[PDB]
Specification:
Chain C: Belongs to the polyribonucleotide nucleotidyltransferase family. The structure is cut from a larger assembly and holds 3 copies of chain A. By secondary structure, chain A is α+β, with helices and mostly antiparallel strands. Chain A has 15 helices and 28 strands. In chain A, strands 8-7-9-10-19-18-16-17 form an 8-stranded antiparallel sheet, sandwiched between helices. In chain A, strands 1-2-3-4-6-5 form a 6-stranded mixed sheet. Chain A has a 5-stranded mixed sheet with strand order 11-12-13-15-14. The longest helix of chain A is centred in the first third of the chain and has 29 residues, at about 195-225.
């Protein structure tokens, strides 16, 4: 019956074990205030067929996030919301690096919101619960880890703020740390604040995570556990690594020394060397798993790359530690687009499109779907696309692609603090990668800032983003970082063989978003501060380059900019205009794409993406309040039309069955309003001659006349 | 050309074949009254890659049963509604046991509703059509089977009733009889009916299914189809079985005879013996399929388990045939939940949560997708969750597992009869299994009964559910049943090795739900009656235990429970408050979770999950609709209002964030006719005495005016 | 196939009708030319249901068999097949689905 209480300033965290799902390898329950979340972790024993960590983590959304109840194709959830994906990705990036290397077994972690009071957020509870469950199970781990959230309100740091304080907070930061004050997960979003407060918040967060770790360590020592022994660790044998190094170090050094190489050429050369070395190894040791050979080669390559970076300060192209690739920016690519931006840094190249849309477009039909998806505070949201062909790869274009969603959320959080408070239309920023060479999220946010800058949306201090990489040479005994180097504007290979990824974006004088992905098992805060400083310098340079192209937003939107207007509809014609159940409007809404709403019984708001579409819709409205339905009728021309229907105010006459019946009205039948058209020889099935005269818009009648024939 | 008519009291079943879908292995058409359904069965001729019966049955649908057309994802019923899932599960549990053992070939059975009239339901017709198609095709079988549905109206057992009958019946039973009067599949839902009536209904149904069996036999004799011979049956060799038995019977008896074992330890010992036995077999017959070895070992284990059960009357852990494992119940686990219950029957443990919700939540956005499923006449519905960690397993959490959906439907039918007639809120009973050891469906039903018992829902006679297993020593010479034993509250292993499974739920006097799937090719009625008696005794005992911890539900639900309030919004500001196209309302809803409905042009209904949520919502509308949210009080009470902002001709005053900040005029505010109210001292926060004239359409809000005050 | 059948049947529908029209076709035995068969059967079904149409709609399939010369990639001899069977389609060179009126 493990149970412990941890005090954080004002909040109390109750961590409990047992009593709930004892069959799982690790079960934990974290309770804060009145809400509580239960986390389970289960790992198999048979080694996975795949040669890598098949770790999966899931965060099941529940009802009381706002007091609503979630309904989907599963009546609770199919797919996820953005929030679930973000929380799952946070938990993954927080717990994965602590796992021992070479551990290749299925491992699934679930977290369920047992009960939500709507006062305390459950995600920061979920991370701690996952840490407890892992540390308390037989699964090997190097944890435990402790996660806290820091907000800033009225110049004061608050640990684990409530939702009410969340709304008014100018900063929302999530810090997950390791024992001995090692940071493992940083995720922050602030409203363009200075870096000094950022450093202070980071220090406070790590200080509190130390207390959390103290408490959980006390619990695990109290209850006592015994980590299971994995049947096999998939680490490469030291002898194979030694032979691979002695066989390929010179060639790898040679191919990494020259600075005339794109991604493709360098990858091809290293792949050829890999083929030769793999053949040599298979000849030398025809008794080992081929994956072991591949892993040995990869380890040798990573070691060589890290060594050359550490000892020569030229990463792979002659760039120093603090530099960046060439940057090119283009705006206004196509007239028909509200805003176009093309941002190309080095090999990486992305395109961002800004398209306006009606406010009502941001709300779905049913309440439940809107609630689960939520509504952005500012009427603005950004979509991020990563098609496979951007990396010369073939893959399923559709689906979810959680990495795409995470990158989109990151970029949207980066761009958020500069969107103006209100706008007549919803901002729909769309960015997609075209040539992917790493740091695509920062480039996408940068290009989106450029596109918004072009579309005339009044913003301030166009945002710029940058990535930071870290290379460490550490002792094998204590794991202490003996030496470290920082890299600015990393490449794909730099990230792949690096130790951590640090994507940070901000304005000319503040930081907006931060998402530090670290693969090492924890790093000291000093490295983080150095990264922040270098990133600030790089951001200044990038902003200089951008402002060299475009600085102030355009005075007005493009002539193709959407227009919102009002239309007056009399009550008498109101029913005819709206149609049964508003069907006509829907049809019109689906015909030209304009959006029609009503403000009162008479005024109607009309939103149109293009002025031409607006004028067309206005003509359609004028027609609707007028008369219509004419087909193949001429003035003074005899038409051999066969009558089909009999009605008081006219006859539905068709020239032939393949023609919409037109109203031959009695009022134009001998110029006398009758309820019996047959008085003028209007007999169904008779090949009469019908002559058109005009129209009656207000009366809603046709001027068809058989009187000329009769 | 097969055509045969079968008479059931007053209904005619026309079975036809050879006219449509002649390409399929077996095609049948069943016509009752004017509803016709065609069923096709196709089986491959190659052994499946898997090593088990890969039966797949699908029951398509046309939504014309209510007259509408299915348009969930396409203009058909591609959405796989819950009713379709239940029907498919019924078909599977009705036809699977009749297949010969070891038949491992892909086999798919599809049902298409050729024509429905809303008078005769097609499901039972679908079962009969599947039976006919299988019996008439070359696929080996031991049928045919005959399915009927029995209803009770005014003490009369009607057979195959019409929809109006289903509406008026107190019982709905479905029987899948087999030749020589054997029951294969039983599925019944009654509105808390007695026991002997249930027995009589079972007898009538099994008597009636003989006629349809006779008809199908006549048809198949007329056509004279010849079954194909399978290329290879996958039953283990008898001699290998003999060797495995002689090798492992001692150890298996030793492990199964002790009474100190959870599920995990017993499974571990079984697997431990399995490894050595497999090694011995490999050393003995290094020429057989390894899966044959696995099957031989499993057969030996099942045989010895059944033998020990039959001969010693002690199943496991010292429990006799009738006694059931321990049960513990807890209520009110968390304050914020509307109702919480925790049930722990032996090793199985399930948590049940009940949360209220608005009636409008039970209706989807459009109409067509709403009609794909019912509306649950007694406003109530159950959600069932079977996460993989409940059984220490790994699996996808999303994808609509048919087993979990069927179990949830069974629990919902079990709990339906005791729900009160009407209730101001929809009831959502969520049950998630945590420790899974079999019979989790009845445990979930009991937990939901407890949760309702706790949330103050005025229900009667808390429902209890139990499971029953059967172990028989059949004679392969005649296929008869020589000795049988009935087990109460089976474990997972007992179900796995048992001949069948029975689930019975009911009140202190009656029976509500009854699902009985049998893995044997039919069983006599006597066994069913014995199972009914045993389940009745067990239900009495379980209710006796349950009532100790809770009874006579709480007079009122928890104060955190939802509240419903009336609101008055006169027209002039009704237009503003609703906003363009109601957008404002939606903007409120997803941002606070409150639900707003328009009672009429003047009144609105407000539904809030918590009183705190209601206060938050009214304050949000206070701060977001340019005015304040409004609450209904007695008209004609002099109050005092604080000033939010100062106007030249008036004020924007309000009393609390629960009545609209009302614009006042000089004739209403300033009796001194001064352009500056600040002369009187009117400032932000200053109280002014106002008269509550009530909500009037002239202003669009409550008429707050000081005609004689100040 | 559904879109092809729908476009085939489109020009024989009156400009207006009091109700939406849903033409659902299900295949039961496939031996090629299923789309034209579905369209023609839908023509019959609409014809029966009472909704007026300009005329009946008939669909057909055409196959082609060519003895090409690989040395030049030319068409030496060709033969046309009416109402192509499934095997002919599978081993043929092309498929032609065409529908119309009288």
């Amino acid at each position: 019956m493990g149970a412990v209480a941890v005090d954080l300033g004002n909040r109390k965290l109750e961590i409990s074990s047992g009593k709930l799902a004892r069959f799982a390898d690790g079960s934990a329950v974290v309770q804060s205030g009145d809400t509580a979340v239960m986390v389970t972790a289960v790992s198999k024993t048979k080694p996975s067929p795949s040669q890598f960590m098949p770790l999966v983590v899931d965060y099941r959304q529940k009802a009381a996030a706002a007091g609503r109840i979630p309904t989907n194709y599963l009546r609770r959830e199919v797919g996820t919301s953005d929030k679930e994906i973000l929380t799952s990705r946070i938990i993954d990036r927080s717990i994965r690096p602590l796992f021992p290397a070479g551990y290749f077994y299925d491992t699934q972690v679930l977290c369920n919101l047992l009960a939500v009071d709507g006062v305390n957020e459950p995600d920061v509870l979920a991370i701690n619960g996952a840490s407890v469950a892992l540390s308390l199970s037989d699964i090997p781990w190097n944890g435990p880890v402790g996660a806290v959230r820091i907000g800033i309100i009225d110049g004061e740091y608050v640990v684990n703020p409530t939702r009410k304080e969340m709304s008014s907070s100018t900063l929302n930061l999530v810090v997950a740390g390791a024992p001995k004050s090692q940071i493992v997960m940083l995720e922050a979003s602030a409203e363009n604040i200075l870096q000094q407060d950022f450093c202070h918040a980071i220090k406070v967060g790590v200080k509190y995570t130390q207390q959390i770790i103290q408490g959980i360590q006390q619990l695990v020592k109290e209850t006592g556990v015994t980590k299971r022994t994995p049947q096999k660790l998939f680490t490469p044998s030291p002898e194979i690594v030694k032979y691979t190094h002695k066989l390929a170090m010179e060639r790898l050094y040679a191919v990494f020394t020259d600075y005339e190489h794109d991604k493709v050429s360098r990858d091809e050369a290293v792949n050829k060397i890999r083929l030769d070395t793999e053949e040599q190894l298979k000849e030398k040791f025809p008794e080992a798993d081929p994956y072991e050979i591949i892993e040995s080669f990869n380890v040798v390559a990573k070691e060589v790359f890290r060594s050359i970076v550490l000892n020569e300060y030229k990463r792979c192209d002659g760039r120093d530690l603090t530099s960046l690739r060439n940057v090119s920016c283009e705006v206004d690519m196509f007239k028909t687009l509200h805003g176009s931006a093309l941002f190309q840094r080095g090999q990486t190249q992305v395109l961002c499109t800004v398209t306006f849309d009606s406010l009502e477009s941001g709300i779905k039909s049913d309440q439940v779907i809107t609630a689960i998806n939520g509504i952005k505070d500012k009427n603005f949201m950004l979509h991020y696309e990563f098609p496979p062909y951007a990396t010369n790869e073939i893959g399923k274009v559709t689906g979810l692609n959680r990495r795409e969603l995470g990158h989109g959320a990151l970029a949207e959080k980066a761009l958020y603090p500069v969107i103006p408070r209100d706008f007549p239309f919803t901002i729909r920023v769309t960015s997609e990668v075209l040539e992917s060479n790493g740091s695509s999220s920062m480039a996408s946010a940068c290009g989106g800032s450029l596109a918004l800058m072009d579309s005339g949306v009044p913003i301030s201090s166009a945002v710029a983003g940058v990535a930071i990489g870290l290379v460490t040479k550490t002792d094998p005994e204590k794991g202490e970082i003996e030496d470290y180097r920082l890299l600015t504007d990393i490449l794909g290979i730099e990230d792949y063989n690096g130790d951590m990824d640090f994507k940070i974006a901000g304005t000319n004088k503040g930081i907006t978003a931060l998402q530090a992905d670290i693969k090492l098992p924890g790093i000291p805060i000093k490295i983080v501060m150095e990264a922040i400083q270098q990133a600030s310098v790089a951001k200044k340079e990038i902003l200089q380059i951008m402002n060299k192209t475009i600085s102030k937003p355009r005075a007005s939107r493009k002539e193709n900019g959407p227009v919102v207007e009002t239309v007056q509809v009399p009550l008498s014609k109101r029913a005819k205009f709206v149609g049964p159940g508003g069907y006509n409007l829907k049809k019109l809404q689906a015909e030209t794409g304009v959006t029609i709403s009503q403000v009162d019984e008479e005024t109607f708001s009309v939103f149109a993406p293009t002025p031409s579409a607006m004028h067309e819709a206005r003509d359609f409205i004028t027609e609707i309040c007028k008369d219509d339905q004419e087909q193949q009728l001429e003035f003074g021309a005899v038409y051999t039309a066969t009558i089909t229907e009999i009605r008081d105010t006219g006859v539905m006459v068709k020239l032939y069955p393949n023609m919409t019946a037109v109203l031959l009205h009695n009022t134009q039948l001998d110029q006398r309003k009758i309820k019996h058209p047959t008085a003028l020889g209007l007999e169904v099935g008779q090949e009469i001659q019908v002559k058109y005269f005009g129209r009656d818009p207000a009366d809603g009648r046709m001027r068809l006349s058989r009187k000329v024939l009769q």
